[PDB]
Amino acid sequence: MSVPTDGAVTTSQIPASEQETLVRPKPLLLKLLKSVGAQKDTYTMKEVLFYLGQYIMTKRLYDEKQQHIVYCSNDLLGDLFGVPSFSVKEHRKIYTMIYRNLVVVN
Numbered sequence: 001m002s003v004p005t006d007g008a009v010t011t012s013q014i015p016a017s018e019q020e021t022l023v024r025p026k027p028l029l030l031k032l033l034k035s036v037g038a039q040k041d042t043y044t045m046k047e048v049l050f051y052l053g054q055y056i057m058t059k060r061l062y063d064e065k066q067q068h069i070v071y072c073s074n075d076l077l078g079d080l081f082g083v084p085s086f087s088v089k090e091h092r093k094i095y096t097m098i099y100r101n102l103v104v105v106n
């Protein structure tokens, strides 16, 4: 392994091949990723999701009493995704929101 630690989350809702896509996060997204330990400039989509999950957890934006919804209207995450809230269960939407904040590599 070339980095000290790594993380990745996958879902049955997105095809494997898509989750392996290599991407280069734009400024705001890269800033959030690094605030939780990420150290690179290029990631696979599943790594991006891992760190974003970590970001949500650390900022305490995840509560089961919120019935699967994350409320990020007052967080930079709300501006990254461009929505006031979203469901952690709707993965295609999450992917779509994330795609706007990056560029696919080569």
Ligand SMILES: CC[C@@H](CO)N1C(=O)[C@@H](CC(=O)O)C[C@H](c2cccc(Cl)c2)[C@H]1c1ccc(Cl)cc1
Pocket (backbone or CB within 6 Å): 009, 010, 011, 049, 050, 052, 053, 054, 056, 057, 062, 088, 089, 090, 091, 092, 094, 095
């Ligand atoms: C916020 C907690 C976070 C912890 O990693 N999490 C989950 O708790 C679950 C929610 C679910 O049970 O469906 C999975 C979720 C996830 C995994 C892989 C791909 C995607 Cl799009 C979402 C994933 C998640 C949810 C949102 C984001 Cl932006 C990134 C990752």
